[model samples]
Target: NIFLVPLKHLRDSQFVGELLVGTPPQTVYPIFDTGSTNVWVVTTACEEESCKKVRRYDPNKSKTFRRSFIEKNLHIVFGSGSISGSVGTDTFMLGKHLVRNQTFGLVESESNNNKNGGDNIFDYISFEGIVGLGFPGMLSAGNIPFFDNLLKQNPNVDPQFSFYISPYDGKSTLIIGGISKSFYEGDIYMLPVLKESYWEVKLDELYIGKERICCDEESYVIFDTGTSYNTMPSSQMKTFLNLIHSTACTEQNYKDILKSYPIIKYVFGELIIELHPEEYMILNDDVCMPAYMQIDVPSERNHAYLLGSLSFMRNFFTVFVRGTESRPSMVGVARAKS
Candidate 1:
């Protein structure tokens, strides 16, 4: 079944959807994340005060529920916070689609510093759980995802899905099997996926208006619906930030800002992903300033670059397409209009 997910903007940022889990099923709104794999929902076993505000899944009530046969514990870390609990299996549903004996998580506890850089990553984002759309191999729990399970059950099922996020009111659609022709228009440009672990693409260069921002060799980036801001290498952020607030004047100067500032451009092979000044510049409207952040990749962690919600995906419609063994997988991009 092709499911159309309705997204709600929590403070005009996180795109969350209502999902059901268990036999009788519990209504829980969670983030539709393409950055990671595995689905997670908090359980009644959680005692956090903030957790009490949202609906939690109780496996005992579901006749079809089954605890993990192999995996014992489940722990997941996202850009916002951390969730840890016991691994279990239950019926999971999204729109008209359903996966029986689906392996997921029952979060027993969560932890986040909260109020980092003056933004709440926990309850403020307000998602009950997270549904990962990346490859199942990336799952920390090593459990099969609902989509993978669906492919096995129905041989006719299409191996791809698409996402459309509206900038006006955060109205979005999620299509499984095949993309709906009505959701998007114009030529669908194809780009090679750098890897399957994440919805990643390569960047050849970056430009700010007329001036070009020097990028490291083979710079790769991920298109993540889970995050709200675009995060680049810490070194590159300095140049981008300087260009936005280059002027010392604090007052509103639309003309001067527009003339001096050009659109942020990301070059991917023959494709150009442009971010207008109005899109990324959210914190302060008076003078051009972006919601972009500096990514400080820990020495122990892999250096990952991300183009997220408010910056990249804001103006584009994306389709994640899976090809056959004879062909390579690709990501389709089209300008979001209508």
Candidate 2:
């Protein structure tokens, strides 16, 4: 049986859903992130300002809660923020589906890397924690991901889950165990996952309109639902900005500038995904900017770009299938049906 969870789209950047934990099931909103592993939530042990702002899970109140005997501390650093926590197991659920004795992180502290220090990561965010949907390879030794355990405990469920991120209006849906045909159109194009860590795939080429831009060699891209925007190598940022003719504009001139922008194409062998100018540009108040962010990564790193929610996911319906012992994992992409 497939489990469907309705997701609330926050500011066109984050997608959150209700997660039930513990014995009585304390409801907590968490971002269903495909970029990382480790399903974590804030606990009552944390007394920080940010932790106080959200509902913290109290292990003492739950009869089914069990703290890990290893007592290992987890410190995870993300692109914009970081979280420090401990490990524990409890009854975890999505809607009515439940997984007994599920291993998850009990976050004690959360902070953003903002230099200004005006606001914390949890200050403006609605979600309290993150539910990582990444593969087992990204997890620590002996710790299994929530999805893996869910599939193991339930024999009837499939090994795949799909996402339908709504562009502007309507509700987004996360389907566990199978795909929803109503959210997408055309044939679902499947690509073999290059790496087991993240949903990593080989990017064949990139193009702006008719001109080929990058991916001369073996370039890789990750389908990250946690990331807000697409990221490219810092070295290539200047060239890409100039090529796209992106400029700072007011709300008045936003449409005029966007009219000149070209369609960005991500080519994966025979499958080509296209993003129009309107979809690639970000308009906030009076300023308009390109959707791509710049990350300083050494050329040696295998993954060159991150296909984030805004850049690619919001425009397409994506499905991630877990790999078996013999066969590799795969990612399926298709045009989203509005």
Candidate 3:
């Protein structure tokens, strides 16, 4: 019964799958992106020819499907191209659980396509689609996230889930319960939840080696599963890397530029989250690009440094929610320890 397969499941769609919405005349392929709080799909109303490739979710096809208008023209930019879609409710599934009248996007506008408009990220996995878990405040206030119906029925999860992810070669689990003693069994610091609608965290100070580089700056953080980099404040970023053991710059290629890009160590609290040799030099699929890995330091006026899911999350465990109280936070189990 319990046998070890080639673990192709690990290599599958990455997420659950490329969710497919279909009727008799149309089909649509929606990218399962939980990094966002909203759910949408491509539709025939879009400008690209790719919308016609997959089966579209037609509100008219199903008797129970209800239509909703968001009032203004809505647009979201994930990677590239302006994505546009309409909002509505329909039947959605998670395992054997069927979430009825689930709100989603019947995508009417979008760009980028696979299979002549079909080869996008959705095709790689067995999942018929993907969903978003971003912006918990809005999902709570609005009360119509794609998975809200599922949470309503399965209130036992306390409206949250947990994720144990290892970007390196390891196993990850998306749990439906609160963290157990075994999950987070060591020294943990509980940060206060931000009041704003975005997924944010407050930063009192950042220590590089022993120096307080960026201090007393509070920022809202983003838990983005799709991105592979980190962005921090400019002043803090420069000092943080200079303290590293390895310092190299493009002096010969560029003029008088001296920056310590590689061989930098990061310490979160008491944990040492060191970047491997491969992290410093991330190769594109084609291996043609040479991009140095470091926190992208932005101007001081911006007010926040977005630690995009890579460096900051390298050691911390966290929870996401639809609401502060009603929904449970999908916890991130911390792995790397000192």
> Which candidate number maximizes lDDT?
2
Query: Residue pairs in steric clash, candidate 2?
Result: none
**Candidate 3 lDDT, 54-98, residue by residue in tens:** 555556666666676687556554432344566776665543344
Best by TM-score: 2
Give the better candidate number (1 or 2) by TM-score. 2
- Model 1: lDDT to the true structure: 0.73
List lDDT for all candidates, in order: 0.73, 0.81, 0.45
| Tens-digit per-residue lDDT, 58-90, candidate 1 | 878888888775545566665567777887788
Question: What's the distance in Å from true for residue 216, model 3?
Answer: 4.8
- TM value for model 3: 0.62
Per-candidate TM-score against the hidden true structure? 0.87, 0.92, 0.62
Model 2 worst lDDT window (10 residues): 112-121
Query: Per-residue CA lDDT of candidate 2, range 1-338, in tens?
Result: 87888888875367888899988779888999898788888888888887886788898889999888655677876556778888888998886887888788888877664443655556667547888899888785235788888888887998888889885775788898888789889899999997778888889988878777777656777888988788877656877888775567887877777887888888899998888888878876666778888865345655477888876878899999888877669999999887
Superior by lDDT: candidate 1 or candidate 3? 1
